[PDB]
Amino acid sequence: GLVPRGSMIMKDGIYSIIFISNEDSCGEGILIKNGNMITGGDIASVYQGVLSEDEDIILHVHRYNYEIPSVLNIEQDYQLVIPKKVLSNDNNLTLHCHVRGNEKLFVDVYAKFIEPLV
Amino acid sequence: GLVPRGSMIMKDGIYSIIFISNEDSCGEGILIKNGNMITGGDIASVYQGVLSEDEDIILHVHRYNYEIPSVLNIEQDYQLVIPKKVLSNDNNLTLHCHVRGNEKLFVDVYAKFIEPLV
């Protein structure tokens, strides 16, 4: 089962990710965790941020292919606030992230551990 | 214009990548370059490798979703050899990568620099 735990407890490695927005649009991507560093992306945007702790974990989202819609229909670069605690297992986790400054704009994410860093 | 250069001279950061295989199947993905470390993936596989410089660069491809076809139709994990030489810019590059052990199996890749990492 999943249990509330701090994100920083996540094992280092590459994860597969699936997410759905308040607009009810879905997307899938990849996520890489190294130290407290988080980098990732899907066919249209890439994301980067640093596991906070003592700070609001901010994830900078950057769109790179506008011929593909944003799961959030924003149309520019934004920030997602990552929860300090997530529901997790040794290899699975879910979290609810919302756009900074707008709780009504959000995505629910499920992440699955794929493998350790080389 | 693109000029021949050492692949290991690529700017660290997040890259979008598009590729076509000898079988005429195309795929798209993301690629992250940190030090000599390269990590990335698409909707069905993830990859990790180390920009060598004294050894042929081996990119380890791990298939994580077998419900989606691989651009090479290998049906298992494999290794790609990454050229020490690439045709590149300060933001673009292309390369021809063959499967370790079989030059007849390969992907021709175009990579676009998206943004540097934190």
Numbering used by the authors:
A (entry chain A), B (entry chain B): -6 to 111
What does the literature reporting this entry say, word for word?
GrlA and GrlR are two LEE-encoded regulators that are required to optimize PLEE1 activity. (2) GrlR, a negative regulator of ler expression, might act as anti-GrlA to establish an additional checkpoint that down-regulates the feedback loop, setting it back to the steady-state level. Here, we report the crystal structure of GrlR from EHEC refined up to 1.9 Å resolution as well as structure-based functional studies on GrlR.
The model was refined to a final R-factor of 0.215 (Rfree = 0.269) at 1.9 Å resolution with good stereochemical parameters. The GrlR model consists of residues from Met1 to Val111, with seven additional residues at the N-terminus (Gly-6, Leu-5, Val-4, Pro-3, Arg-2, Gly-1, and Ser0) resulting from the linker sequence of the (His)6 affinity tag. The GrlR molecule mainly consists of a single domain from residues Asp5 to Ile107 that forms a β-barrel. Residues Tyr59 to Asp70 form an extended loop that plugs one side of the cylindrical β-barrel structure. The β-barrel cavity is highly hydrophobic in nature with side chains from seven Tyr, six Ile, seven Leu, four Val, and two Phe residues lining the inner cavity surface. During structure refinement, we noticed a small molecule composed of 12 atoms in the hydrophobic cavity of GrlR, which, subsequently, was identified to be the fragment of Triton-X100. A loop region in the crystal structure of GrlR, residues Glu46 to Asp49 (46EDED49), is highly exposed on the surface and is less well defined in electron density.
